[model samples]
Target: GKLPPGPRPLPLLGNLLQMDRRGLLKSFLRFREKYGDVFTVHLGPRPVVMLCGVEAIREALVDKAEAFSGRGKIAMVDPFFRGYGVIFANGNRWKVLRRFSVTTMRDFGMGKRSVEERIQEEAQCLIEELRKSKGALMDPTFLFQSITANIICSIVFGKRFHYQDQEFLKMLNLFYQTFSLISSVFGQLFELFSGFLKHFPGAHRQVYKNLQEINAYIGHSVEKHRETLDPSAPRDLIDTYLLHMEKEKSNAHSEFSHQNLNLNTLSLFFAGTETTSTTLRYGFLLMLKYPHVAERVYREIEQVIGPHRPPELHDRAKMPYTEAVIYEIQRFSDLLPMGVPHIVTQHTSFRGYIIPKDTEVFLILSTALHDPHYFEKPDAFNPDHFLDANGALKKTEAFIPFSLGKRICLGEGIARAELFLFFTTILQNFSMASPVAPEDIDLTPQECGVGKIPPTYQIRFLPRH
Candidate 1:
């Protein structure tokens, strides 16, 4: 019964109460300090083995890759979503789908000239959208979803959404629903006592409703693709997936079926939307909170990219100050604090203790991002973490915002491009500030239960020109 040191859980509640009390990300930080680098906490009904800090995380997810390769499960989500998509999948299905999706997306202009132009166009469109505000006060969250999510939407469906389109609006709302439900404490409770929670009607049902909407929407998209899908010329992910599904129709073991396609496409669309938009939103918050930092970024963008041309991927290289600030925002935000769980595929001995086969692992990334060893004054928002003596961007090994190993985000390239390009374009065109005085602005999250949902605050988008 040798397990790493962890805070003992209360009778049936496990550490749920403590998790809620301290906040999710803070709990990981707190537990790591108490138990050292490795430990086991009964995070819910399951005893979750947590790997804290860069070394431990690297060891589990990277060094001993196969042992920790399996994606962990959450009971409440699995049945409804069926653990089919890249995020929840394990074993061969995960491997095939992940590889296929990444390759096909790259083919469909994921991180290339076409997508870059689309993003640049989207950024300009975003600027126009801001213009309509005319310096009025409103939260940027809803406005943001249209601009960011459509980058992936265009890739998945071969076209983007109109901000005012009813279908687009409902889908965006559904995207929020799934993201909020999974990250919320209610979601965590459902994960643990799913057997009991299933009996009671609650918020989880909304997750189902939205999921159904998404699937039906996906189903509709597939039908649309089927009408025009020329096997000789595929349109987008749906086209590519349908082509594969038809080819592998007889392969009973093949994962490339309608269900997998819908799930993976939804995963791509959903995952792509939240983190990028949230980071940008928090980036603005940081800028407002620290005006000097904000101005510095604006100055950098003005100097490097200038006003006449929109920001390009090449512009990122010359604007190290802007780059540092963006990275610093991610580090401070630590968006997916607890991280999605992972599982050990085979029986393994780690650190003189036995982590038996199929043991659930929480590769908590937030602590690693905030690890004092790598970052100076980890709590503060400091771009200097990524800046060297010459004030240029420098690589920090512990910066694992995308997590590590084979499990690193498939959309890493796209997200980085979107954040830098979209953010730079914003600074290039407008001045962003809160309605309240800078000092009076509160930067706390509106909801810390699931994901760290940023506090909603209205800002006046004053046109610089």
Candidate 2:
């Protein structure tokens, strides 16, 4: 067996200079051209194996999944978040928490009409909020955040907050602030020098301090749920999880302890809203940038579901152009460029290379989404890529934007329903346009790192009468 090829390390810094300033997505694409599909790159002292092509990623994450199923620990994030939650956990702990998470969400109507109803209701609330905008020029970020944030609260806490709710709004502010920090320059530096960086004052320290408050906020809810546990009739995720944890507590080595309870619960609640909401903001950016595309979506909704009806998950199949546009939005945005890195669970043999256990693996998910072999215009924002010549929607195998295999995003179904409902419903109610010229609405990400947040811009939603 052999190690994957990569740029040679030069003492301390290694291949740090080789990474693109813009972000990992662009850098990995360039590296793939130089080094082959599977290679290596050093981030300071840490050597991470880079998987580029769809096949290698699929083989590692899906084909020989268990061997590659470990979630690689991020030195940058771990000191703050620790390794207690689903996204960061490995081995049996990951299995236990993820199993409970999936089962609990499913019981709460995850992939079914039950949860879709909640999304539809929230879409109406979203439309009502947009209508109140009175076609004013405004940033759509908080508006999008409010909708999803409220829905997530309803999902996990069995409660919902008004758009103006102070406590709710404060926590969301924390979410945005902390997320931006972790993806900042200092954030990346922490990854490289966490051992040394931990002693000094940095942005992560501030974010971590802020997170502790939010942690307590969620923790309070967990303890409350434990006190009010109704094993027979679980209300939301917390209630269900508390009951589940009690049953599993007898196992001496159980991962369902209180710390995991808080971490997993908060982790789900945090991620449950953020990614989908950000993707939506990006999708709206695409719509504003391409009004012709928006127009067709409006027409599709008109023909398929009539003018006033809200979009539904079941209704998605009947509206191919709408489906295609939604698919294209996800593909083009490339939200999680590098995604979550996987660690080798054991010393593994792969394509003649011996990857040691705990070796960090980097899979460029955007490569698969943007792979020219699968997508027609990988760079351009085109819905036709998912369509047949006859105009019916066709599935593309490389459309693994939500990721693939055993470690794939658990909320994939819920997120899809939310995107479709929110996107189509908003389009149905309004013909959005920026105050600036359509050409002037730049769609470039405002910031890029762990997440790609669209630049600040304003949209006016004119009622579709």
Candidate 3:
């Protein structure tokens, strides 16, 4: 079979040298310019296939679901994860655990009123905290991260942590470090060279140490839940899983092992915290960049929900511009530019290319969301991309921040609600402006490991008039 068209590769390094060691997304986007949607490249010895464009990604992820059934290769952390967590698992384990997670999250009010109340409570606290700052320039990322993570913590562990508490700060730091290291080139190289470079100095050691600390923390939580497991009245995720284990003790096919529980909880923390916090941080930055957009959102809040009350998820329809702004933010930011890679479980054909079973494939989500075919100007931060002629919020197939298919982001509903509520609440209470001139505000994000983070800067959140 003919190899997919791509930039000519060097002897050993292949297309690796073409990679911008730090800016992987930028490099991928540049490559897409040269090689359309589907392209092949060898990273070390691995032959990886990348799919760009909305049609290619949609067909592969949504249509060819049966064929694209496995998580793409991740060698180093695979040992730590071992196909157990919702993000990494495959086959029976993935199906069972994914179902359990989705069900439990829903039961805990993920998309319902109960969960919304918790978010509202947190939003109130966040507003109060911002008020204390008295419109001084603040980074808000750490606090935002804490609040979002606590929501997941509340659901999974039935607990929340004080923002200034040392233990909570340490836990947050550990997650930050873990996530940061995992998405780094060093981290990727470590994974590629795991067996030989295990003892080498730098991030590998730090990552392992961080993972150990996180594992220990999780282990303690699991033990506490196990010891206090109430058969009749299950509490959070831990308690619910324990209850399920007891009931399914006789079932050999059950995948509700304690190990799986630990990994999944870790997965929840990583997924629940990092992505949402990043998006919120970017939302604030964008508002500062586009004051008119911010004013429009604030006006919507004042008109629909009023400035005094915290915005709620149900208010989305009433606040169409606010809703459209959030969708546009997700699109323009293009945070998860490269969607999580998946592998073909069976022979598949897409756009004239025959992919053999087990071949690694990537869905470049950024391509779809930013496709010129979908949006009028894919690169611009225009809210009209999500609004119809009648000014109603319109859903587009290209607007997939959480991705699509069976492996779509499990925490999407919760994430969406949190972003909407937190964003509107903040805007309603405060007007964000950079300490520097708006033109000087850096919209170009710095590449931080697995994410493109807004450049470290302070913005004053003036009390709304």
Candidate 4:
């Protein structure tokens, strides 16, 4: 019945003063130094079990996955989702929705050729969009968001929105706002003190407003799908979900419902859009910071794909350097460093401590990502971590950017394809250059809480031709 050891907590505050709210990941790493890999840290009054380093994280998330697969509380998003969707739901609801979503997403070409074609098609659109900048210094924030959103839209809505579509642009803005706020200091505090903050007024409130607007837009899309749904031919995620609802209409205990359809669609759209795009943004920023690395990637693109055609998923195998760069990007970027919180599904024994069911656990993904045992230069931006002496892409159990276990990122397949295709395709078309000197271009995250927000910078995309 013993728990992991850590600094003692106060009556209510509970380690708040001991940790950095603005930089929880840094605080966790610091705590790991003192308290060992497994320790306890209280956010507000809640005692969250912390799993640090590759061994601890892999042990819990991989070895005891089912016992630890429960979705923990996410105060910032829980208000809107309310355990309705795959991302937030737990138990039976989570099981059914996640299973259906995985199958349905595959049917709609999530990681297969159809989705690759969609990404390839969107990559072309992205090239066209960037070409308009004409070597002008561009932020690429909105551009990447649009490209990622369009791919998700094609899967969920069965259509892609034009970049100029006001409605589409508005929705994308809301998503950007939602993520920024969720990763902001206020968002960090909200997760700790949501009960108190929810009563007062602040930017944190905007997250809910933004989510509502997003869900409303998703609801509208679902309505359109429902009206035009052909039971025999499921077009996309929405239609397929609607079909499930009809099949299980008579079953009172069925998980398929109108509420789930809307929320799940929102889940796919939002989760699918943000993470991959942010990784792309960070990957490019690293390319800007490391021009030599960028040149090497460009050379790989020329050797394998050439400038004639867009990079394909199959091309990823032949281009080990490019694949290594993407892997390094995922590893070094440290997006979702703490990862989404998980809970013990049962009274589980972890390491030597007893963790009861439903106790919140924080899996420090950065620990594994930056584990020195796994990488020679865990702190540096080196693609060689993924490349063996033979220049072949080497696989490591520690490069878990999408996370691990049952609660691992559902969009991992889609994300992997997107990063490979998008990164290669863009570098194939243009050589990226930052406005500032390489050393001046900072790689530190602007914000780190729910996710790591990459630093905003401008880059000029010079056409290769």
lDDT (tens digit, per residue) of candidate 2 on 133-154: 7789887877787787766777
Most lDDT-accurate candidate: 4
Error of 3 at 237 (Å): 1.0
User: How many clashes show up per model?
Assistant: 2, 0, 0, 0
Candidate 1, position 104, lDDT: 70
- What C-alpha lDDT do the candidate models reach, one value each? 0.81, 0.81, 0.80, 0.86
Q: Quick one: best TM-score, which candidate?
A: 4
Q: Estimate each model's TM-score.
A: 0.95, 0.95, 0.93, 0.97
Residues 193-214 of candidate 3: C-alpha lDDT, one tens digit per residue: 5655666677767766776677
Q: Can you rank all candidates by TM-score, best first?
A: 4, 2, 1, 3
Question: Considering summed lDDT, which 10 consecutive residues are worst modelled in model 1?
Answer: 104-113
CA error at residue 434 for candidate 3, angstroms: 3.1
